[PDB]
Amino acid sequence: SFSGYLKLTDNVYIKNADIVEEAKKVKPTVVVNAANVYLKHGGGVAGALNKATNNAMQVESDDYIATNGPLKVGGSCVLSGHNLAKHCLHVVGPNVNKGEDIQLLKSAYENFNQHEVLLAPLLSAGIFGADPIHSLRVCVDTVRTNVYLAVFDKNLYDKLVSSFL
């Protein structure tokens, strides 16, 4: 189904790809969003996925927050995948740039175990400020379901693969 991924472990795969383009092509059952507790999809993966939905993700997310309140750091919710996937699993990894606890990254990845297969970014990486090498390590040590990681940055992808233990 997913093409061109490098197998890291029994269940973790990685590719240098734009997660928006991966989602449009594959139309996976689940695309993971690098969400914040307010589901305000301003930038990074969230801003990019929301822009690909023509803001439908943000409109749906605002209604979800109006009804349910904010998510917890380390938590998630399942919403529509719009034109990108059947569902979007909005997962909140800790944002180290907001001083959040990096220990919550394992809790964030545990949300992936509720889905047999997912297309996902590295949680807390990019604008969330965590070390992406550490994120990949927590991913491989926490996620047991099939996760296809899309890493937008080629230089970061090369660093992640070449340093993977």
Ligand X SMILES: CCNc1ccc(C#N)cn1
Collect all residues with Cβ–Cβ distance below 8 Å to 108 and sequence separation of at least 6: 73, 74, 75, 76, 91, 92, 93, 94, 123, 124
Give the residue nearest to ligand X (CB).
48
CB 71 → ligand X: shortest distance, Å? 19
Binding flag, residue 126, ligand X (CB under 6 A): yes
- Nearest CB to ligand X, comparing residues 19 and 92: 19
Collect all residues with Cβ–Cβ distance below 8 Å to 74 and sequence separation of at least 6: 92, 93, 94, 104, 105, 107, 108, 110
Binding flag, residue 20, ligand X (CB under 6 A): yes
Single out the segment in contact with ligand X by CB under 6 A; choices: 15-23, 62-70, 82-90, 141-149: 15-23
| Among positions 28, 44, 74, 94, the unique one binding ligand X when judged by CB under 6 A | 44
- Measured CA to CA in angstroms, residue 78 lies from 44, 82, 163 at distances of 19, 12, 32
Single out the segment in contact with ligand X by CB under 6 A; choices: 1-9, 13-21, 59-67, 95-103: 13-21
Structure-token pair, residue 71:
């998510």
Binding flag, residue 48, ligand X (CB under 6 A): yes
Binding flag, residue 18, ligand X (CB under 6 A): yes
Please state, as a whole number, how many other Cβ atoms lie within 10 Å of the Cβ of residue 86: 13
Single out the segment in contact with ligand X by CB under 6 A; choices: 12-20, 64-72, 135-143, 155-163: 12-20
Tell me the one-letter amino acid at 53.
T
Helix, strand, or coil here: 7? strand
Structure-token pair, residue 62:
């605002």
Single out the segment in contact with ligand X by CB under 6 A; choices: 7-15, 41-49, 54-62, 73-81: 41-49
Binding flag, residue 19, ligand X (CB under 6 A): yes
Residues forming contacts to ligand X in the complex (CB under 6 A) are: 18-20, 44-45, 48, 126, 152
